[PDB]
Design a protein around this ligand. Structure first.
Ligand code: RH
Ligand code: RH
Length: 124
């Protein structure tokens, strides 16, 4: 299958741009990363940093995950992100999203050998 690490990359990594400047970024990205295929994924975050910089977060500040697991890690430095949030008017299969650009600390859950990001928990 798609590995948990690969799925994290597909759902959450967009190293190609510095920041979603485009009001329409989320409509395009949610579609092309297959997050609209079965339903409208209601919220999703994309990270505009190198893969190495996001993998390195698995070595940074250990914090509790939202689900109570202990394997979450907060970035020491702020990172360029985009939050995608489904609009009130969005109706599957025309998934519609508000695109919000921010510089925030990310929190990711890490798993495996090697120890890599598998889940995007939060930004702060
Ligand atoms: Rh997850
Ligand atoms: Rh999941």
């Amino acid at each position: 299958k798609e590995t948990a690490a690969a799925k994290f990359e597909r759902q959450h990594m967009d190293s190609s741009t510095s920041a979603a400047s485009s009001s329409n970024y989320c409509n395009q990205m949610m579609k092309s990363r297959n997050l609209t295929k079965d339903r409208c994924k209601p919220v999703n975050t994309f990270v505009h940093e190198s893969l190495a910089d996001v993998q390195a977060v698995c070595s940074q500040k250990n914090v509790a995950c939202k689900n109570g697991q202990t394997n979450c890690y907060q970035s020491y430095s702020t990172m360029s992100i985009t939050d995608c949030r489904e609009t009130g008017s969005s109706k599957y299969p025309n998934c519609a999203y508000k695109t919000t650009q921010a510089n925030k600390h990310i929190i990711v859950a890490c798993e495996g050998n090697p120890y890599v990001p598998v889940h995007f928990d939060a930004s702060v």
